[PDB]
Design a binder for this molecule. Structure first.
Ligand SMILES: Nc1ncnc2c1ncn2[C@@H]1O[C@H](COP(=O)(O)OP(=O)(O)OC[C@H]2O[C@@H](O)[C@H](O)[C@@H]2O)[C@@H](O)[C@H]1O
Ligand SMILES: [Zn+2]
Length: 182
């Protein structure tokens, strides 16, 4: 499994070293692939802070230049392990990952769904979890759209205009993860 263990972050994982899940001190783990071994980056929090900004697809960390779109760096491929999505666990599970869904508007900027769309980030995330190849119809004002997960785009069904859609976590710094563990 590539899923960061929630129990290890909170009160503790009873499975100890035999847990099938990943045990890490953060709810995210950023890694590069060198040979046949995934290797931890050094400045995970800086990378995560860049990832969680939807208007940022480039992140220079160390000598590395990271491209989030492609999930590679220099030439090497990267990945972000994660706790489960927050819609998959009760609200008590404070270490779940909260995924925000955004669309890019006329004026070039990223607007959160719900901020007006009749779908919000929890809606879309829930559908995306229960069906990642889905197409979500929705309405905004008097206009009607379809959001294609597998394409990560929204299309106005009348004019067929397309707009990008992006899914990124909310950021938590390590100091706040430590506060949550108190
Ligand atoms: N998911 C959304 N949620 C809220 N508002 C949205 C969303 N997506 C687009 N909009 C906004 O609603 C308006 C509609 O834009 P689009 O539906 O993306 O595309 P389009 O219908 O081609 O643009 C409208 C224009 O096209 C012409 O047919 C007509 O003259 C109209 O002025 C724009 O202001 C756009 O920024
Ligand atoms: Zn565990």
């Amino acid at each position: 499994s590539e899923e960061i263990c929630l129990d290890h972050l909170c009160k503790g994982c009873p499975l100890n070293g035999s847990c099938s899940k990943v045990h890490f001190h953060l709810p995210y783990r950023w890694q590069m692939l060198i040979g046949k071994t995934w290797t931890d980056f050094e400045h995970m929090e800086t990378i995560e802070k860049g990832y969680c900004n939807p208007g940022i697809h480039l992140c220079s960390v160390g000598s590395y230049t990271i491209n989030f779109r492609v999930m590679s760096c220099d030439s090497f491929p990267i990945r972000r392990l994660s706790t489960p999505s927050s819609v998959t666990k009760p609200a008590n599970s404070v270490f779940t990952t909260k995924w925000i869904w955004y669309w890019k508007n006329e004026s070039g900027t990223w607007i959160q769904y719900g901020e007006n769309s009749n779908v919000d980030s929890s809606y879309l995330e829930s559908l995306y979890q229960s069906c990642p190849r889905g197409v979500v119809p929705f309405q905004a004002g008097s206009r009607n759209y379809e959001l294609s997960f597998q394409g990560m785009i929204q299309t106005n069904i009348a004019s067929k205009t397309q707009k990008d859609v992006i899914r990124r976590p909310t950021f938590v710094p390590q100091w706040y993860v430590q506060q949550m563990k108190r």
